[PDB]
Every structure is written in structure tokens, then in C-alpha cells.
Amino acid sequence: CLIAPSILSANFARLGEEVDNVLAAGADWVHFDVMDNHYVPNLTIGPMVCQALRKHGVTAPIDVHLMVEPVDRIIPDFAEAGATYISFHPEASRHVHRTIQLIRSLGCKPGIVLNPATPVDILDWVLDDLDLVLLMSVNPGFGGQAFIPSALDKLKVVRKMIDASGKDIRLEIDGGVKADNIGEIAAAGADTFVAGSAIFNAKTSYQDVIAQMRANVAAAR
Amino acid sequence: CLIAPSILSANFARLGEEVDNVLAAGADWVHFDVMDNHYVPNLTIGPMVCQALRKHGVTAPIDVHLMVEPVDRIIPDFAEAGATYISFHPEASRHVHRTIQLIRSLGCKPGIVLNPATPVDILDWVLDDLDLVLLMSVNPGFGGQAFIPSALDKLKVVRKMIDASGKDIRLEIDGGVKADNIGEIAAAGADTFVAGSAIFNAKTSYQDVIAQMRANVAAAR
Amino acid sequence: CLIAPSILSANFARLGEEVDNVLAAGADWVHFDVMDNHYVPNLTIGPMVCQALRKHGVTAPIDVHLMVEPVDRIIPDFAEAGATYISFHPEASRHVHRTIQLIRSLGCKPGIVLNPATPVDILDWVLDDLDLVLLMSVNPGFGGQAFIPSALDKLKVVRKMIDASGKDIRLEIDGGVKADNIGEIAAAGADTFVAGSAIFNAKTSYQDVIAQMRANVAAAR
Ligand SMILES: [Cl-]
Ligand SMILES: [Cl-]
Ligand SMILES: [Cl-]
Ligand SMILES: [Cl-]
Ligand SMILES: [Cl-]
Ligand SMILES: [Cl-]
Ligand SMILES: [Cl-]
Ligand SMILES: [Cl-]
Ligand SMILES: [Cl-]
Ligand SMILES: [Mg+2]
Ligand SMILES: [Zn+2]
Ligand SMILES: [Zn+2]
Ligand SMILES: [Zn+2]
Numbered sequence: 020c021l022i023a024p025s026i027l028s029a030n031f032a033r034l035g036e037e038v039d040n041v042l043a044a045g046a047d048w049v050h051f052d053v054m055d056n057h058y059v060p061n062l063t064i065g066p067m068v069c070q071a072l073r074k075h076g077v078t079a080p081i082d083v084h085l086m087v088e089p090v091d092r093i094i095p096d097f098a099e100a101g102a103t104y105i106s107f108h109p110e111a112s113r114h115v116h117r118t119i120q121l122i123r124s125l126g127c128k129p130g131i132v133l134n135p136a137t138p139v140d141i142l143d144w145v146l147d148d149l150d151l152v153l154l155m156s157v158n159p160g161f162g163g164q165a166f167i168p169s170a171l172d173k174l175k176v177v178r179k180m181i182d183a184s185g186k187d188i189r190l191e192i193d194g195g196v197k198a199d200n201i202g203e204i205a206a207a208g209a210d211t212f213v214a215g216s217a218i219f220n221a222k223t224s225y226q227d228v229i230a231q232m233r234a235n236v237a238a239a240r
Numbered sequence: 241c242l243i244a245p246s247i248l249s250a251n252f253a254r255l256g257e258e259v260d261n262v263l264a265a266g267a268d269w270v271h272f273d274v275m276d277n278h279y280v281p282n283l284t285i286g287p288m289v290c291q292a293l294r295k296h297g298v299t300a301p302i303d304v305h306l307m308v309e310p311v312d313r314i315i316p317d318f319a320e321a322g323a324t325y326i327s328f329h330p331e332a333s334r335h336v337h338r339t340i341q342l343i344r345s346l347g348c349k350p351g352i353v354l355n356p357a358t359p360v361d362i363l364d365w366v367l368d369d370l371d372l373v374l375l376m377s378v379n380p381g382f383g384g385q386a387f388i389p390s391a392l393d394k395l396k397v398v399r400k401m402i403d404a405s406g407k408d409i410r411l412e413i414d415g416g417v418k419a420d421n422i423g424e425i426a427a428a429g430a431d432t433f434v435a436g437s438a439i440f441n442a443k444t445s446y447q448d449v450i451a452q453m454r455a456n457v458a459a460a461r
Numbered sequence: 462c463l464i465a466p467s468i469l470s471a472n473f474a475r476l477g478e479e480v481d482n483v484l485a486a487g488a489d490w491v492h493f494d495v496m497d498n499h500y501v502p503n504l505t506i507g508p509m510v511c512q513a514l515r516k517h518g519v520t521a522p523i524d525v526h527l528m529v530e531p532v533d534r535i536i537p538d539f540a541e542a543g544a545t546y547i548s549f550h551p552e553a554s555r556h557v558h559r560t561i562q563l564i565r566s567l568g569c570k571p572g573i574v575l576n577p578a579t580p581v582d583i584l585d586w587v588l589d590d591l592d593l594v595l596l597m598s599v600n601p602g603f604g605g606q607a608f609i610p611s612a613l614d615k616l617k618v619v620r621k622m623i624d625a626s627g628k629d630i631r632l633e634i635d636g637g638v639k640a641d642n643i644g645e646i647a648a649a650g651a652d653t654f655v656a657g658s659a660i661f662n663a664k665t666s667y668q669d670v671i672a673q674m675r676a677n678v679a680a681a682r
Contacts (some may be wrong), residue, residue, distance in 0.1 A: 027288065030292060030295075030296075031255060031256075031288060031289050031292035031297065032255055032256030032259075032292045032296035033254070033255075033256055033296075034252065034253055034254075034255065035253030035254055036254075037407055038253075053283065055276050055277040055278065055283055056276045056288070056308060056313070057276065057277075057278055057287070060313060061286065061287075061317075062274065062276055062283075062285075062286030062287070062308070062314060063285075063288065064283075064284075064285060064286070064289070065275070065277070065282065065283030065284050065285070066282075066283070067248065067252060067284065068252050068285070071251060071252035071253045072253055074251075074253065075251075075253035075254075087277055087283070092277070092281060093277055093283060096282075146330050161425075184440055326515070330578070334500060334501070334530075334552065335501070335576060335578075335579035335600050335601070335602075336576070336577075337576065337577035337578045337609065338599055338600035338603055341600070361580040361582060362578065362580060364579075364580050365577060365578050365579075365580070365611050365615060366578050370609075414530075
């Protein structure tokens with residue numbers, strides 16, 4: 020369904036070119052990983068970089084994943100910079116329901132991110148307020164890793180929860196997604212796919228990798 | 241003496257072009273302001289952006305100003321990414337002498353940053369171990385601001401301390417530096433000048449602004 | 462004057478034996494470095510170990526150096542466990558004067574610890590309330606290190622301050638103190654000497670090292 024390349028793997032010296040080209044190559048969203056050196060042991064890119072992409076002319080959805088703690092102060096800055104989706108980790112907010120409301124009140128689409136160990140019942144009382152749930156299939160902020168197999172089982176659980184809600188909620192997956200496992204991940208229930216190194220560091224073009232990913236997703240459904 | 245444009249004001253969609261052009265226009269260093277959303281209320285750019293500039297072919301000194309707390313974990317990442325100078329705020333480290341030693345042990349040039357209110361006696365026992373002292377003439381992380389006049393008096397104090405040490409220590413200034421005040425700032429003792437919006441958002445070219453700054457500095461000495 | 466071996470370097474499988482033997486060998490105090498994994502990146506020993514030495518029959522002064530933050534909660538536990546001196550880092554307490562008063566109110570002797578970079582003016586308004594000032598000549602919590610030469614100059618400054626106060630205040634030194642530099646350190650003004658590896662990991666007996674240290678201090682005064 021939706022392909023959302025992570026730009027952590029792109030050439031940050033020519034970020035506008037990279038984003039322009041990956042969207043032309045078939046990507047739907049720009050996935051924007053924000054790390055504050057506290058919630059995870061790395062520091063990446065803040066609102067000014069999102070704003071720069073909008074000023075450069077990017078009109079595709081920008082999907083901002085906040086690996087930061089606390090989260091509320093920076094959310095208005097990402098809204099002002101032109102974020103489309105803003106997702107966050109419930110452990111990183113003292114008032115999860117308020118953080119969701121804040122994102123929505125600014126005109127952005129709120130998402131919740133589940134770390135690999137995070138139990139699904141944190142969705143019990145907020146799921147209907149969400150536009151997106153992201154399951155991490157690697158540990159965020161710890162670099163290039165292999166897909167964690169239990170994410171396939173957790174995807175099936177959250178897919179059932181979203182389907183039972185009757186709401187249009189994206190089910191996103193991030194971590195070690197590549198051409199040769201995206202079919203199984205789609206069959207498990209994901210419909211929004213974040214890939215970084217598999218696209219930006221491929222031996223073939225961005226368009227070839229994205230086309231293979233789509234073909235593999237279509238064949239598995 | 242040295243011109244160190246802050247890339248926070250540059251076009252981050254074409255960062256390599258901006259840096260290439262500002263260096264061609266007469267800049268000496270790339271000044272790299274790193275904010276972690278905790279030490280200051282903003283989040284900017286991390287080690288991956290420094291690495292990207294090195295991979296792009298930038299060979300000029302990269303001057304990394306850490307507005308982060310704590311500081312020690314990220315310092316090796318900036319060293320590996322190709323930082324030349326790494327400066328930090330002593331308030332942000334529990335063991336200032338160790339943090340300096342760490343920077344030096346990685347082959348980088350350590351600096352200490354004094355916020356506008358920070359008394360100079362934090363230099364008492366570390367000055368001889370430094371390659372750079374940076375005085376902030378705006379409050380860091382709070383945006384485009386006007387030069388704080390007390391910075392001129394503090395520059396004179398720190399110039400005397402550096403001169404009395406006999407060591408080769410840069411005296412850097414950052415905040416609201418522009419063509420029409422850089423002469424007075426140089427006369428107060430600074431020899432390394434950080435400017436952001438005055439260069440990257442100027443109504444004339446980067447080369448014109450930098451040439452005026454140099455002429456104004458030369459006329460004031 | 463006073464020798465205070467640091468038991469961090471002792472054999473913790475036979476701590477009572479080690480402490481008994483080093484006091485029998487001529488040591489005056491038991492120096493007790495307490496690290497909470499937060500103020501420094503290591504965790505050592507808490508009040509229960511102090512209590513075990515008292516229960517074992519140790520009657521010499523136990524000199525507790527708190528490298529912990531915050532400090533007030535654990536101070537009554539060290540007093541109850543039989544600490545004699547309790548020293549702490551002013552940076553680790555939000556109310557340095559109160560922390561001193563708390564130590565004194567429990568019948569213990571309060572000390573202030575200066576890290577290598579810490580300016581001496583933190584002593585300005587509390588020095589008369591202290592029984593001890595400790596200068597760190599290594600970075601605390603970062604392991605076996607070499608004596609930082611600037612500690613000799615800071616000892617001379619703090620020696621003058623204590624002498625001008627007219628109060629009986631110990632001037633303690635900790636970090637890389639060994640037989641071949643203890644003379645110079647004493648000449649700089651220290652009268653209370655913490656050594657760890659030089660005593661407990663020495664190639665000669667405790668009684669020989671302590672006698673050599675004492676002879677070297679006497680010859681330097
Ligand atoms: Cl709200
Ligand atoms: Cl986890
Ligand atoms: Cl990462
Ligand atoms: Cl080190
Ligand atoms: Cl300030
Ligand atoms: Cl800012
Ligand atoms: Cl009290
Ligand atoms: Cl220090
Ligand atoms: Cl240690
Ligand atoms: Mg539960
Ligand atoms: Zn992400
Ligand atoms: Zn700066
Ligand atoms: Zn100690």
C-alpha cells in the first residue's frame with residue numbers, strides 16, 4: 020500500500036535531490052526520524068530540516084517519528100514546519116491522550132509507536148483517536164539491525180484491533196524491512212512500509228527497489 | 241581573522257551547495273550548532289550531517305558547538321564524523337576536565353562555551369588545555385536575537401586571560417554578529433567570528449558580506 | 462600528616478582483613494569512595510559496607526567521599542553506619558549550606574570536594590563550616606589515572622585560604638598519589654593523602670609503602 024522511505028540513510032549534503040528522486044521513484048511519504056540523544060542514544064534532525072523540505076517544494080506527506088522525550092514542546096514546531104503525521108512513543112509522554120489531542124489540534128495526523136517490547140494495551144483507550152500505529156521491528160536509535168521476528172506476530176494482533184475499530188488507521192512497520200521480507204510483513208498486516216538502507220543504499224536504483232517491494236507486497240496479499 | 245558561518249541559517253535542502261558556496265565566498269570554517277531539545281529548547285542536527293559534509297568533499301575545519309546535555313556520549317560520534325573543533329558548555333558536563341580530555345584524546349580541538357551570564361572563572365583550571373573559547377552574545381537556542389552588549393566587556397576580560405596564558409587559543413563570538421558591529425567586536429578581542437543570518441540571508445552575496453566583514457575587522461584593529 | 466588509603470583498590474573478598482592490615486601498617490583513616498552510577502559512571506559501595514567495617518571492629522576514622530547526586534537522602538544512612546567524615550561535591554547538592562549543616566547535625570565532620578575544574582570560590586561562604594576540603598587530582602569515577610599537574614597549583618591556593626580562615630580544616634588530595642610524588646604534593650599544601658593503587662596494589666608491603674610515603678612527606682616539608 021504505502022512506501023515511506025527513511026531519510027536517515029540518504030545523502031544529507033543533497034537532501035532535496037534525494038527526497039525529490041525517491042518520491043519520483045515511487046515513494047509515497049517521506050519518513051523523518053527525530054532523535055534527541057535522550058530517548059535514544061543518537062541525535063538526528065529537527066524541525067528546521069522538515070521546513071527546508073517544504074520550502075524546497077516537497078508536497079508529499081512528511082511522516083515525523085519522534086524518538087524524543089518529553090514530546091509536547093517540539094510538536095508545535097514540527098506542525099509549523101509542515102509535518103503531516105506526527106508519531107510518538109507513549110512512554111515518552113506523561114499525558115498520552117493530551118499529546119494526541121495536541122497533534123490533532125495543530126492540523127497534524129497523530130500516531131503512536133510501539134517499541135518491540137511495548138504491550139498493545141496502551142492502545143486500549145486511545146486507538147480511535149489515532150491515524151497511525153507504528154510497530155518497531157528493530158530497537159530505535161541503535162542502528163542497522165535485523166528485523167525482529169516477533170513483530171510479525173504483533174502486527175497480526177494490532178491489525179485485528181484496527182479492523183475491529185472500524186477506523187481508517189495506518190499500520191506502519193519500521194526496521195530491517197527489505198525486498199525479501201516485505202511480503203511476509205504485509206501478510207502479517209502492515210500497510211505502510213518504512214525502509215531506509217534497502218532503498219537509499221541499494222545496488223540497483225531507488226525505482227527498481229520500490230517496484231520490487233510493491234510487487235512482493237501485492238503477491239503476498 | 242577567521243570567519244565561521246553558522247549553517248543553521250542555510251538551505252538544508254541543498255546543504256552541500258550552501259557550504260561549498262560560502263567557503264568559496266571566503267569563509268574559513270563551517271560552524272555547526274548542535275541542539276538536543278534539552279540543554280536548549282530546540283533540536284537541530286547530529287553527527288550524520290557532519291559525516292555527510294565530509295563525504296561531500298568539505299575539507300575546511302568543521303567547528304561543532306554542542307548545545308547538548310550530557311555531552312560525553314555524543315563526542316566520539318562527532319569525532320568519527322570528522323569534526324575539527326568540539327566546544328561545549330561547562331554547565332552541561334559533570335566533569336569538565338574529563339570532557340576536555342576526551343575531546344583531545346580523539347584528535348579534536350576542545351573548546352569551552354560561556355553563556356552570557358557564565359562567569360569567567362570556570363576557565364581558571366582548564367584554560368591551558370583548550371584550543372578555543374566561545375562567548376555567546378545571544379541566548380543559545382532561542383533564535384534570531386540582538387547582540388548582547390555585555391559580551392563586549394567579557395571579550396576584553398577573556399582576551400586578557402588568553403594573552404596571559406601564552407597559549408594559542410581562538411576567541412570566538414556567536415550571536416547577532418553582522419557587518420555593522422563586527423569591527424567593534426574584533427576591537428574587544430574576538431578573532432573568530434560566527435555569523436548566520438547576516439551571511440546566509442543577506443540582500444547581497446555571501447562573498448560581498450564576508451568581504452565587508454573582513455574589511456570592517458581590519459579597520460578596527 | 463594523615464594517610465587515608467582508598468579501599469576501592471583493596472581485595473573486597475577480604476575487606477576486613479585488608480582494612481585491619483592497612484591500619485596496622487600505619488594508615489590513619491579508611492577512605493571510602495561512594496559512587497551512585499549517576500554523578501560518575503561507576504557504582505561502588507554503600508552504607509552497608511561502612512556498617513560492616515564498624516561491626517568488624519574498625520575504630521579508625523572512616524572518611525566517606527560521596528560521588529553521588531543528589532546527596533541528602535543517603536547522608537543519614539552513612540552517619541548511622543558509622544562514618545566519621547562525609548565529603549560531597551557542591552555541584553551535586555541544590556543547597557550546599559544545608560547539606561553541610563545536615564552532616565554536622567548527625568555528628569559527622571563535613572567536607573567539600575573540588576573536581577579538577579571546579580573554581581575555588583564555591584568555598585567563599587562555607588569554608589568556616591567545614592572540617593575538610595578535598596581536591597581531586599584525577600577525574601573521579603574514570604579509573605586509574607595520572608595526577609593532574611594543576612592540582613599542585615590549586616592546593617597552594619586552597620592552603621592559603623585555609624590558613625587565612627584560622628580554622629582547623631584538613632586539606633585532602635585524591636588521585637594518582639604515589640610514593641614518588643607525595644613529597645611535592647605535601648609541599649604544595651596537602652596534609653591528608655588518599656592513595657589507592659599505590660598502597661593496595663604495590664609490589665611492596667603496606668607497612669613499607671606507608672613508611673616510605675611518610676618519610677617522603679617529612680623530607681619535603
Ligand atoms: Cl491539547
Ligand atoms: Cl523494547
Ligand atoms: Cl540510528
Ligand atoms: Cl578521557
Ligand atoms: Cl546566560
Ligand atoms: Cl535557534
Ligand atoms: Cl539541616
Ligand atoms: Cl572537572
Ligand atoms: Cl573508578
Ligand atoms: Mg498492560
Ligand atoms: Zn521511524
Ligand atoms: Zn554556535
Ligand atoms: Zn575519594
